[PDB]
Amino acid sequence: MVLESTMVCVDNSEYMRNGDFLPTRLQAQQDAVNIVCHSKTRSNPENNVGLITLANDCEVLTTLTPDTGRILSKLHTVQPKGKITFCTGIRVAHLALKHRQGKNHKMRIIAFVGSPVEDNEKDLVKLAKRLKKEKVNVDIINFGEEEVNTEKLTAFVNTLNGKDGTGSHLVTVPPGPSLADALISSPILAG
Amino acid sequence: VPGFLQQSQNSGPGQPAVWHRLEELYTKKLWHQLTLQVLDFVQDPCFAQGDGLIKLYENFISEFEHRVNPLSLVEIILHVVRQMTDPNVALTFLEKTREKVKSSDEAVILCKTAIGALKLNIGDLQVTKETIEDVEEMLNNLPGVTSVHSRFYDLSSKYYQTIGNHASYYKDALRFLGCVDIKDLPVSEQQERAFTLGLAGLLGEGVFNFGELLMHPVLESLRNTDRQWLIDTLYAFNSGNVERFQTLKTAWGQQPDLAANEAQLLRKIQLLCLMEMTF
Amino acid sequence: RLLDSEIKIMKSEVLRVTHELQAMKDKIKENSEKIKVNKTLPYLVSNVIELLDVKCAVIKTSTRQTYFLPVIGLVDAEKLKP
Amino acid sequence: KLLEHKEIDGRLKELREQLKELTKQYEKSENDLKA
Amino acid sequence: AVQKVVVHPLVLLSVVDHFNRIGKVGNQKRVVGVLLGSWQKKVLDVSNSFAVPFDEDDKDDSVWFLDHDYLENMYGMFKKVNARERIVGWYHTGPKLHKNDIAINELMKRYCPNSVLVIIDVKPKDLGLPTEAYISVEEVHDDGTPTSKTFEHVTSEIGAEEAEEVGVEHLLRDIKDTTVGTLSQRITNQV
Amino acid sequence: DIPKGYMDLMPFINKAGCECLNESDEHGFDNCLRKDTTFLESDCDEQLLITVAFNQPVKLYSMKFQGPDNGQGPKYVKIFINLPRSMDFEEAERSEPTQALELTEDDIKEDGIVPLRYVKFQNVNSVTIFVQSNQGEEETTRISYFTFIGTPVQATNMNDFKRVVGKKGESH
């Protein structure tokens, strides 16, 4: 509904060769990207989207664009290779989305955590403060190999949306054969 | 098919930690966690007897595997091929993987290096050029991972078993040592590599001693305790002092392949003396 | 069991290839129109001379001057002749 | 079930062949525009 | 490999203009742009360059924007005006390399198999050769040293096409010293 | 009020331009843009970075950073112009402003107009204000009202163009 630019951040770690979701996690995250980006597209054609990989070299596959076809096309040969480097991935996401043409568009980060993530406890909590001062709304989805919202990630997201902000969600997927339906139940349309 | 994770529950130290560990990963379809541990156990100090189960397990895992990393098969198959020890069935053992391993991951090179090693065992020269020259050109494209290069250069260093490979053996052994240098295996193997590299340098027709390996940590920190004569004559070469007594010392230290080549060795030392003396 | 292992694969890649084909067609059309705006008369009729490789043509103008072309142009080398 | 799979797979193969042809005329257009 | 790269006045003036443009408002240790050139034998001739939206983190040395789509469509339009010039190499003004730069070169390798990087230290106005050129190398080093993704120096020099030559000479005319300079210039050249 | 020969630069701002940072969700940029008691207050801390773009390039002559007398009014502001990209708080702390200004209590009142180095603002398209401190050192800074005074620079519509007279359609 809101006028926004969204950076989807899909995992391409070797851990993506897990298989808890429907037949292949590798294919499954593509349908997840499809359903999340379609929501941002149908809300308003001016709302725009880019994409990023968080694992290995955090390369910007797509710059912010209203052409969703570029995002769905670039999801090919995403080639799960490395491991989630979230520490730099989340910040490069915002650094990339802030180069947006239409500055009135809202901040929005959606990222796929499909691998175990290691980070400094003392600082990950204040990266939330960083993105707060940068006014960035961040929704993070966690996968089965994440042991259901590690305390660090829960604290980080809670302080990022603390004091009853937008309530940007940290959605853990129900482990096993389940898609990103937990987002489209309500959080993607409310939060 | 699912009954195999219980039939295989025996034949391992600590049945839970070795079979139920991967059973929990297999049951709830979480795949990459399984692939982590399947490779983990093949290095166990046992006779890798679980491979006997793997003879059927490969069928039960790969009917609808749909996730498996190609490295996370070839790395275990190159150990099962060593464990089985039958050169005839090794060729068909590698093939049923190599036929399906053609993905974007460059893993068929591991299979090629493995069959090269097996063929070098059974006939060091017959067609062993082909089983290495089919990798040399494809060693290009993606030279960044360098573990494939480690395996290939180890194989082509074992190619020193071919009679004439001495100087090229020195070059390729140095290249392999540059592929990986941290310990990763007993100091006995490292000192053996250093010793053979020293003989290769002292024996190669076009290589004499060369430097910066005398300062390479992988040999100097290892032979100050034993077999010092090799480093002593290497220092003599890198100093040019044409010397008899320590040359005889390294001669009795390793008689064949070093002592019967005195005429060659002398030609090196004197040559090097000129190099040192105009230096 | 059957027909379930390819529902997602068959239903998506064709759409992506079709979209790429459509955009590729539009870019072809744009290139063709850019060529079309650049083939306007006059054409200064002239005679052809022998071709060279380093495929490339030589022209004798009706104005009686010789030019060499690094590339022959919009026509193909096989059709033309001295 | 194999009939629908063959239909979609043959359509994909024909579409990719037509796409190679279309990329060929695209390359021809770029080559003659560069010319 | 590549034995030589020759650099024309236009690219160095363009990067000087880019540096003044960015440092005017957004003073930063470097600016990053893309060169255009052609290949003769195994020598490279570079005469065109455009600024691309770029950003580097101060110390994380892994976080960086280089705009994919901007680079692509800017190259397309520069090809529209002049189709001979294809993407070879990328330039930056920082007098020093960074641990972050090899990632920039790897991205540029997507657009050119042997992309070459050029450091143009605009601030220095000193002894000589304000351009440094570097290629990417990955080899076993043949001496037992560990291999690494490395930058390798390739010799560079300044050469001008005739139009750029008259253009540069006309501006240099007032401060221009004579080419012959019978005794004074020769003795000063020896000193 | 206003100076002689100048008019408010508000009609020339762009809604897409506004990207004030660190603002409280309850009290936003539109509030300090209004001549009302509605104000902007910062959200995380006293630091507040507010950027504004213009439809056409404009010469800035003076600025009115009016704020409440509760000690939350802006005290030290860095002024940057024509930013290429979005601007980071760390950069604002480290970058040299087009003009570093220290507001006094008289400047922040409703009649307080702050002069600017008009020589430096002649082709301004996007301004950035980096409110670094407040008088009372309060946790959050409040901007009662703020606009820019100056004059348009007489730009043109690039893509307008159009043929006016001549051969109508084709020529050399």
From Swiss-Prot, chain A:
Molecular-function annotations in GO: identical protein binding; molecular adaptor activity; polyubiquitin modification-dependent protein binding; RNA binding
Similarity section: Belongs to the proteasome subunit S5A family.
GO process annotations (BP): proteasome-mediated ubiquitin-dependent protein catabolic process
Entry keywords, A to Z: Isopeptide bond, Phosphoprotein, Proteasome, Repeat, Ubl conjugation
Domain statement: The 2 UIM motifs are involved in the binding to a multi-ubiquitin chain in a cooperative way.
Quaternary structure and interacting proteins, as annotated: Component of the 19S proteasome regulatory particle complex. The 26S proteasome consists of a 20S core particle (CP) and two 19S regulatory subunits (RP). The regulatory particle is made of a lid composed of 9 subunits, a base containing 6 ATPases and few additional components including PSMD4. Interacts with NUB1. Interacts with SQSTM1. Interacts with UBQLN4. Interacts with UBE3A. Interacts with UBQLN1 (via ubiquitin-like domain). Interacts with DDI2.
Cross-link position per record: Glycyl lysine isopeptide (Lys-Gly) (interchain with G-Cter in SUMO2): 122
Domain VWFA: 5-188
Protein's UniProt name: 26S proteasome non-ATPase regulatory subunit 4
Leader sequence residues: none
GO CC annotation, single: proteasome regulatory particle, base subcomplex
Lineage: Eukaryota, Metazoa, Chordata, Craniata, Vertebrata
Residues of the full protein shown: 1 to 191 of 377
UniProtKB/Swiss-Prot annotation, chain B:
A GO BP annotation: proteasome-mediated ubiquitin-dependent protein catabolic process
UniProt superkingdom: Eukaryota
Positions of disulphide bridges: none
First and last residues shown, out of full length: 4 to 282 of 376
UniProt family annotation: Belongs to the proteasome subunit S11 family.
Subunit structure: Component of the 19S proteasome regulatory particle complex. The 26S proteasome consists of a 20S core particle (CP) and two 19S regulatory subunits (RP). The regulatory particle is made of a lid composed of 9 subunits including PSMD13, a base containing 6 ATPases and few additional components.
Domain PCI per the UniProt entry, residue ranges: 168-279
Organism: Homo sapiens (Human)
Molecular-function GO terms, alphabetical: structural molecule activity
Gene designation: PSMD13
The keyword Signal is assigned to this record: no
Record keywords: Acetylation, Proteasome
Function: Component of the 26S proteasome, a multiprotein complex involved in the ATP-dependent degradation of ubiquitinated proteins. This complex plays a key role in the maintenance of protein homeostasis by removing misfolded or damaged proteins, which could impair cellular functions, and by removing proteins whose functions are no longer required. Therefore, the proteasome participates in numerous cellular processes, including cell cycle progression, apoptosis, or DNA damage repair.
KW Zinc (keyword) present: no
Name of protein: 26S proteasome non-ATPase regulatory subunit 13
GO cellular component labels: cytosol; extracellular region; ficolin-1-rich granule lumen; membrane; nucleoplasm; nucleus; proteasome accessory complex; proteasome complex
From Swiss-Prot, chain C:
Protein location: Cytoplasm; Nucleus
Post-translational modification: Sumoylated by UBE2I in response to MEKK1-mediated stimuli.
Residue ranges that the Swiss-Prot or TrEMBL entry lists as coiled coil: none
Related illness: Deafness, cataract, impaired intellectual development, and polyneuropathy: An autosomal recessive disease characterized by early onset of deafness, cataract, severe developmental delay, and severely impaired intellectual development. Patients later develop polyneuropathy of the lower extremities, associated with depigmentation of the hair in that area.
Family: Belongs to the AAA ATPase family.
Binding partners and assembly: Component of the 19S proteasome regulatory particle complex. The 26S proteasome consists of a 20S core particle (CP) and two 19S regulatory subunits (RP). The regulatory particle is made of a lid composed of 9 subunits, a base containing 6 ATPases including PSMC3 and few additional components. Interacts with PAAF1. (Microbial infection) Interacts with HIV-1 Tat.
Name the UniProt record assigns to this protein: 26S proteasome regulatory subunit 6A
Species per Swiss-Prot/TrEMBL record: Homo sapiens (Human)
Encoding gene (name): PSMC3
Swiss-Prot record, chain F:
Domain PITH: 1-168
Coiled-coil annotated spans: none
Protein name: Thioredoxin-like protein 1
Organism domain of life: Eukaryota
Gene this protein is translated from: TXNL1
GO molecular function, one term: disulfide oxidoreductase activity
Entire protein: shown range: 118 to 289 of 289
Gene Ontology, cellular component aspect: cytoplasm; cytosol; nucleus; proteasome complex
Compartments reported by the entry: Cytoplasm; Nucleus
Tissue specificity field: Ubiquitous.
Function: Active thioredoxin with a redox potential of about -250 mV.
Key words of the record: Cytoplasm, Disulfide bond, Electron transport, Nucleus, Phosphoprotein, Proteasome, Redox-active center, Transport
